[model samples]
Target: SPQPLEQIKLSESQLSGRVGMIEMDLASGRTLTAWRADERFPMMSTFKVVLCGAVLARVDAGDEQLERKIHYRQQDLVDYSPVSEKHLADGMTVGELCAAAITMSDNSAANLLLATVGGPAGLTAFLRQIGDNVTRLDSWETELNEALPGDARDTTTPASMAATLRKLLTSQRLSARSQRQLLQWMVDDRVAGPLIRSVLPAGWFIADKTGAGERGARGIVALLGPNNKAERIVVIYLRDTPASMAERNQQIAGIGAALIEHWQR
Candidate 1:
């Protein structure tokens, strides 16, 4: 039997610093939040999900192939990129790059795919064209190189991202093959998904991407499941959470466990 989602209550303390959050039981067609969920928050790195989707859109349309190689020279390597440590000085195939980008949170790999998909403008257009309507992508380089002028740096609301998550999962805006490929890349590698992923119960799974930066922004877009099937889309975004990283993650973990408890009840 399905459980009542409202039975899972997350206290304000458990959600401290959380600017936005949205949870949906795809099986029951229910929404779990507001003001905290509808507000726009800096995507930080989680926007990579959108960027990945944009690239996959092209793949679906046959504009690009994942097998093609994309070179990320030493000069292109950013300080935080895992590419410098795990990959070659030459390059990797688009599929390999996507894997590294999502599973390892590789920066150059993300930038390489971004350039292939036509940058922020293209990302913004793709979101709107596919009917997601509100999220925006400014630039990953801009995010890494320097801060933006206002609170609106590469932003997305929980609602908007959840919408995009549905498209990614359902193939409403993607081909069947592309959907399979993208979700496979998003599967929790355990290394990259430390936020909500850490607390989900056994039999429940998540394919997600994590995002955060020095400016205090952080978030995640994920497909959550129980019984080994994708059953929910969970999006949580945050900024200005003054807690230490450990504390913040604890808060996220608490929320996650509560959600799973209700889900599995």
Candidate 2:
């Protein structure tokens, strides 16, 4: 069998897109595989994770409360906002918004949280505060998915994303409860979780957020392991391809499959 890196490159070749990926050990922070790890790619919905992290940080400091209800109107709704559109009247709690954004990739829910965190600029500030200077959010949902060629707005490098996630989940940056809540939300993700899980061998666990955009851009940032213990972080992004969504998904899954097949070898 090809090595994991070679397998990932092979999968990228089959898809005819730029592939950026990183596989890192969660416990030791050791990078096991890296391909274009420092290159930028549109963050898409994956920015929700960092957005929620900013919210959690505010909550930790008692500046915000998750139970606080936020009311919105029809005009606030954006495209691909299933959950927020349904709750137009009664509104949703801050925590509920986080859940909807992460699990469902609800664009309106993300925008709501984005506002609370002070929009793109605010979120970028949060990333810098958390020691991640490579990731930046330049626009809101819908537009952020433009995935325009050569545009650096709303982008993150695979290495920066993996490191930032590690800091959020294990560096004691957030309270224990906040960390657990974030992990739970990712584990409950309904967007990319099912597709990735379907391809993994039995006994392996996955928690992830997926993003899709114009020009066949797609990506996933995840924690994966066996026996339900998260041992590694995997971040994969594909951009500027002309493949179908199903084919793009399969290519990402193929890289994940290779990681599982040759873990720690």
Candidate 3:
């Protein structure tokens, strides 16, 4: 059941650019990885996974409640996903905002959650405290408005991102209840589309976060398994594919199916 990574043969798919992937066996923490530590890629909405954790950590500490509501002015509204965009005048509860943030990948909800937790610096410090110190956080507003200042934009190596998800999934760094709540939001998220979920075997599922950029910097970090189970986890960061979402989606499915079949056996 151990399949060599070289057998993937992405060259035949006309794949361009680098990819970082990690497949972890949750029961053992054993990992099969490829170029996972090679480079850091801009995380885009994918970083919202941590943003949600940053907020939920406070929940774990009893400092906040998801039911709490935050009022936003018209100026706070940003045109993005239909779900939150349409709710501009009505504002949203903390829980609803979080659901919108993940389920719809809504930009305004992400910013609201980011700001609620004391901005990028706060998240940076939190990650440092939890041992993922190299993970970076930057302003979503500015980053979305234009280009990242350099390649140094808010980024994470596949290694670090994989470890981040590991801790979250195993509940090693937070309350299990908190982790479950976050996983619920992730599973409910439609924004991940089919990048990770579509390739799984029957009745299997993935709770993941997806992010995309104009230059094909699209990727996902996820926990995969049968219903209500956490069997394995996968993180893939990619760039420089042809500018076709369909192509990228198909490629990801192929990679996932190969890996899942090998590991699950």
Candidate 4:
């Protein structure tokens, strides 16, 4: 079936496409909204949050020093990728690199931090131990392209990630200070820019993260929950489409924003 097209202008920058999201209220398990929440798809840089959590956990366990620097050589560089040798050779601390990986999707920073945080296999085990059975992780750019037959890519649904993020927001294992640090890191990942942070006329502080790729798009939102009633998580994802990048972004942003507002009321 032919899909509908949207006639909205996205950012001036060209955008790729993909599908994923996760939003959940910590106090209440109620999902304000979710699409393919449990379905699996490429993790994109969203996986950075997982590695970031692990890094924090390691630091908490005294296994890693936040100020320690990791060296980067040109040989370690992956061409055609965002993070470069020169950018990383300055030797980044575990903390700064973790922030770069999430806030900027810096491939160089992520590779180094992921390696220190036990790589994909180790990270996956950590998730599994914490009871996130559906999550998985692998190479830095594994999900960006289909490099092999069925080497296709592992997947993560918006719902699964939402539930996990919810745990991070409330888990007693991580100190209050660390929780704040993680939230600060995520604010940078939200797709909006100056003046657009509060997109709707009502002025809502919707802290969220959005991802788009070849054939899918998604947005996830978490409400700090006014009055301390409960934290909120809402996830929406769209895929299996041929929509233009601009069209898809608008659809995602519009629908996602609407869902969060609906929950607030």
Candidate 5:
């Protein structure tokens, strides 16, 4: 098999887009492979993870409660709110909002949770508070996925994202229960599971959030390992490709296959 970096480059060439990736050891923070790791890419729905992290942080600080029920109206609905739209009349708990946003990528649920934690600016502040200086959120869902060339709004570097994910999942920043909850939400992801899992070998496991946007922007941030343990962090982003969604997904999976094949090296 080709080296991991070479494999990633080959996938990027095939997709006709820039690919940024970082595979880091979850316990030691060691980067196993990196390509364009410092460059920015649109965050899309993947920001829901960080958004929920901010919510959990507030909960940890006694500033918020996950059991709190947030009510919204018909006007709050967005393009892809499978979960939140159903809860419009009865309302959803903060924890339910997090579950919908993370597992289902429910746009309206994310927006509702976004409002609770303040907004794009508030989430960015939370990232800053957690020492992630390179990731920022400037817009809401749908618009945030614009993936405009040369635009920096609502973008994050692969390295920063991986590092921040590591901190949120493994650091003392969140209470133990909160940390476990975050991992569980990602573990229950419905968006990227099928494609990502299909490409991996048996005995390996995955927890992830995926994002897609205009200009063929697509990405996944994940925790993957063998034997049901999340031993590593994988963050991959693609931007400005003219490829079809299938092609884009295949390219990401190709990169993942390389990682799995060359994991011990």
Candidate 6:
């Protein structure tokens, strides 16, 4: 499983001068090239992954249907460019909210859903329920988030994030159908930057989410290739470094694809 990354000769050399951690697991469906896979990096926009998890956890409980609608009041607020302007104060199903949150990195969808699904408190409960370690949620919004209790910030390690993702991908929380939908959405997300997606080929048919930060960016790029479930994973986390974001991402994409090729070859 670990041999795939090496098989392509895309290791620390091809990725030299990059501050990141890379873990390649073909067992599940992942490929990570990063600074420290086990270290914690601010999630930036990637927190949407957890948001997706929270919503799906609710779905798994039958407490909410994917088609159920959540209304936006005049005071609820919708700003930040990720969400469509036409979607202002919209009435959308929970499924749409989940999709928009990840694919488009919709802030309103995340803030609204995070609040509706038990707010910050509920996310903690869900994280614990899933047995994820060291994953914490900072306040959900940038405007109002500065005042969020210091404790609300969510910190996740590449190891934990990858392991948790592996479990989720394996349907540790929801049904196989739910897992399929979640993975499908992650793969379909159009945004790719700063993390695993950055290092990958453009439109590589690899589904993943990208989180941007001043100096830290992370990604989880998953694909279906021949290997054990855990071996199929790629978990990447980078932080506090001077590597050019574009170059780093391109490298990650290149390295990740190389590993995938190894397993198939």
| Best of the two (4, 5) by TM-score | 5
Candidates' C-alpha lDDT: 0.68, 0.91, 0.72, 0.59, 0.91, 0.61
| lDDT (Cα) of model 2 | 0.91
lDDT string, candidate 5, 1-265, tens digits: 5778998899878888999999999998998899999999998988999999999999999999999999999997889989988877799999999999999999999999898888999999999988999999999877999999979999999999999999999998999999999999998998878766776788898999999999999999999998878999999999999999999988888788888888894
Q: After superposition, how far is residue 8 of candidate 2 from its true place, in Å?
A: 1.9
What's the C-alpha lDDT at position 13 in model 6?
Answer: 53
TM-score of 4: 0.78
| C-alpha root-mean-square deviation, candidate 1 | 3.6
TM-score of each: 0.85, 0.97, 0.87, 0.78, 0.97, 0.74
How would you order the candidates by lDDT, starting with the best?
5, 2, 3, 1, 6, 4
In model 5, where is the ten-residue run with the lowest total lDDT?
Answer: 191-200
RMSD (CA, Å), each prediction: 3.6, 1.1, 2.9, 5.6, 1.0, 5.4
TM-score of 1: 0.85
1-265 per-residue lDDT for model 2 (tens digits): 4777897789778878899999999888899899999999999998889899899999999999999999999998899988999988799999999999999999999999999999999999999998898999999988999999989999999999999999998888999999999989999999878866776788988899999999988999999999878989999999999999989987887787788878864
Tens digits of per-residue lDDT, candidate 1, 1-265, equal 1132231134334434445678876545467643366677777667776788888888888888888876656777765676534555556888777777788777778888888877888888888888877788876653642323355647788888887777776755788888887788788444556544445666877788877755455666777878888788877665665566665555555555656766542
For candidate 5, list the clashing residue pairs, or say none.
Answer: none
Tens-place lDDT digits, model 4, residues 1-265: 1111111112112233333444566665666544446666655556777778888888878898779888787667553335444464477788888777666666677778878867888888888877788877766643442322223354466777777777666675567767777777766663442224555445444444444444543333344344433356655555555567667657666554544445543
In angstroms, how far off is 70's CA in candidate 1? 1.4
Mind giving the per-residue lDDT tens digits that candidate 3 earns over 159-253? 78877877765755778887888888888878664634554577776788887775667778777776647677777766755557776665666
lDDT of 6 by residue, 63-157 (tens): 87899887776466556535534465657788888788788877787787888678766776777778885776746655322222222255566
Q: What pairs collide in candidate 3?
A: none
Candidate 2: Cα lDDT at 230: 93
As a TM-score, model 5 comes out at 0.97
2 versus 3: better TM-score goes to:
2
| Candidate 6 TM-score versus the reference | 0.74
On the 0 to 100 scale, the lDDT of residue 28 in model 2 is 81
